[PDB]
């Protein structure tokens, strides 16, 4: 069995050597001449109240107007950000909700948590009262995330080291992704839905093919867990955050890390990440109660969205890029412009 | 557009009139997490109070709502799914004294890890020791040998506060009290009065297990209130 270990370590050395060979210049060196974006002093423009406990996740809507948020008091609330009016209220069966999603067709919203179950709700019921449509079961550990591909396909990640894909109509699994030694804490569909990348609790991020139910690559470089992940808008890269208080960017083609964002004063862990529509900015939530805007092409900090009284646990940006949003353990949301 | 705005305002008014009702029930309920090693007799306690990735048990003491969540069907990697409970009244922590490879050291390290956790420097923790009779049997028959796994058990001296139950063998009392102080050597370092530990002794089938947690919840709430007023 040892010969297998020698083969594995030799393959690891080969992959490392190939990555080094493909490494000639750094992203900062290439972008050493671009202009700085300047000080980005945003300011709140709304504030939504009604969540009893800490907001653990929120998702936008495809129209950039509505949004859905989830708290650990057992409640889903769909706010109209323009008028800040509650449209729906849904009492969850499992109070320990840990994620939420908004269907692209704006008709369904899904959530999951410590009960291992993913539940689907219908927004356009004939009677108008929101009720459970289909319950998806089959995981053996808290569900750390979920996303929609269309009105019928939903992709989910769990704390059992496996990502699963589902057919909502029948309720049966269609694929099972495996290969993570640690819990998967997030994922993000590609812009064209071809691929999806998940980061897990071993400092490794794995890229998959949604159809063949197989793995494609594996990115490493972090020193601790990975709590957040998201695709760059063009779909050719992604970035993540880790408990080592650093953010990084990995290019699919390069198969290696391009740059790392860090600062001495920062000694806390990131909890969320997102890009802007143009892809020239990068936000992230810290447990120090401060968000931060990192210049993607310069790695220098360009601002801070201070104003939360407690840990930042989620974040989001509209498709059109008009309004950021953030939740926190203080139980209040804040729209930023 | 005026009619649509009026309809939206009415819908929001109904939603808020429902959320105000909801806010009145979530404030009259206590959230308690029930930890405990696998072989700690944890379930026997739950079976007493009652008489999927999480099991929920609801009860009430003197018309006070309690909410007790039992973990299950989860991997033994705790350092992430544990943060969800940073807002609980108190985390029950059952243990077996007869544990003494030796599960007692594992429980000691786990309790220390909980204590020194940042998201939980404000989440009080209750402590049980649920293998008292087993410890008594193991020490009576000479099979204790606690000195082997602890180089300081024969040089320990019983505290002056001992109030032993009838028929208690001095050696049994000394040992059982020795077990307690090992954990309390941690719960009195870096405490700073923000959160506390409540040592206790209880058999797995003790009826009073509800009363002890009820009283400890009362004390925690009172202390937090008094600390809001700067009276403590």
């Amino acid at each position, epitope marked *: 069995l040892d010969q297998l270990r020698q083969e594995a370590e030799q393959l690891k050395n080969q992959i490392r050597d190939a990555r080094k060979a493909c490494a000639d210049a750094t992203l900062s060196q290439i972008t050493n001449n671009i202009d700085p974006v300047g000080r980005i002093q945003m300011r709140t423009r709304r504030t939504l109240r009604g969540h009893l406990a800490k907001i653990y996740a929120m998702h936008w809507g495809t129209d950039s107007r509505l949004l859905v948020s989830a708290s650990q008091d057992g409640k889903l609330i769909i706010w109209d950000s323009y008028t800040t009016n509650k449209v729906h209220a849904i009492p969850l069966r499992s109070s320990w909700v840990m994620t939420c999603a908004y269907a692209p067709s704006g008709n369904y919203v899904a959530c999951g948590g410590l009960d291992n179950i993913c539940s689907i709700y219908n927004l356009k019921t004939r009677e108008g009262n929101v009720r459970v449509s289909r319950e998806l079961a089959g995981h053996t550990g808290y569900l750390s995330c979920c996303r929609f591909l269309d009105d019928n396909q939903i992709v989910t990640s769990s704390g059992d080291t496996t990502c699963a894909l589902w057919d909502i109509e029948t309720g049966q699994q269609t694929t099972t992704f495996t290969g993570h*030694t*640690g819990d998967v804490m997030s994922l993000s569909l590609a812009p064209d839905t071809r691929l999806f990348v998940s980061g897990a*609790c*071993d*400092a490794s991020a794995k890229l998959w093919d949604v159809r063949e139910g197989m793995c494609r690559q594996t990115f490493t470089g972090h*020193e*601790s*867990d990975i709590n957040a992940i998201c695709f760059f808008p063009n779909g050719n890269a992604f970035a993540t955050g880790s*408990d*080592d208080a650093t953010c990084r960017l990995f290019d699919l083609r390069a198969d290696q890390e391009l740059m790392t964002y860090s600062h001495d004063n920062i*000694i806390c*862990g990131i909890t969320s990440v997102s890009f802007s529509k143009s892809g020239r900015l990068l936000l992230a939530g810290y447990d120090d109660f401060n968000c931060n805007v990192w210049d993607a092409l310069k790695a220098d900090r360009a601002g801070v969205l201070a104003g939360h009284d407690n840990r930042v646990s989620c974040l989001g940006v509209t498709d059109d890029g008009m309004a950021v949003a953030t939740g926190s353990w203080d139980s209040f949301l804040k729209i930023w412009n | 557009q005026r009619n649509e705005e009026k309809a939206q305002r009415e819908a929001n008014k109904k939603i808020e009139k429902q959320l105000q009702k909801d806010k009145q029930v979530y404030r009259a309920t206590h959230r308690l997490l029930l930890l405990g090693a696998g072989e700690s007799g944890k379930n026997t306690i739950v079976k007493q109070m009652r008489i999927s990735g999480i099991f929920e048990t609801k009860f009430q003491v003197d018309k006070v709502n309690f909410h007790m969540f039992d973990v299950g069907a989860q*991997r*033994d*990697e*705790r*350092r992430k799914w*544990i943060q969800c409970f940073n807002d609980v009244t108190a985390i029950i922590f059952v243990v077996a004294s007869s544990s003494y*490879t*030796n599960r007692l*050291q*594992a429980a000691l*390290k786990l309790f*220390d*890890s*909980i*204590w*020194n*956790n*940042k998201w939980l420097r404000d989440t009080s923790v209750i402590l049980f020791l649920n293998k008292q009779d087993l410890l008594a049997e193991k020490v009576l028959a000479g099979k204790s040998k606690i000195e*082997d*796994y*602890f*180089p300081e058990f024969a040089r320990y001296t019983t505290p002056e506060d001992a109030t032993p139950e009838p028929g208690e063998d001095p050696r049994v009392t000394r040992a059982k009290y020795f077990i307690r102080d090992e954990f309390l050597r941690i719960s009195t370092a*870096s405490g700073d009065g923000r959160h506390y530990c409540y040592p206790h002794f209880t058999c797995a089938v003790d009826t009073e297990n509800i009363r002890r947690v009820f009283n400890d919840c009362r004390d925690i709430i009172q202390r937090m209130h008094l600390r809001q007023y700067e009276l403590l």
Partner: nanobody
Amino acid sequence: VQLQESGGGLVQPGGSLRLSCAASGFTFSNYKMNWVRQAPGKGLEWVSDISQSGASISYTGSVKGRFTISRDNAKNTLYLQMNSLKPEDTAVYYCARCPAPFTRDCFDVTSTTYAYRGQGTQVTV
């Protein structure tokens, strides 16, 4: 992240032996350190740990006064010293690390599938 043990072997009862842990891929100083071993027919059990700078140490009771734990942050290596080994010392020794830096707590080190835990080295008595 990499943790490779070395320096094991065979020793008769009451002998001595030194274990050297070589690590790379992370800044050694910021992370606590642990020694953990597993014996046949039994699950993992904890042995010892050392603070970031070594100012704080602690042992399991049954090992107290026998072994010694020391870390050389300048050489990003950890050490364990063996003396007066009893028959029950036969086991593999895993060189471990805490998940998050700058923290006092340390979770999951004795877990069945901890991620940052070396392959271990064998000591037989």
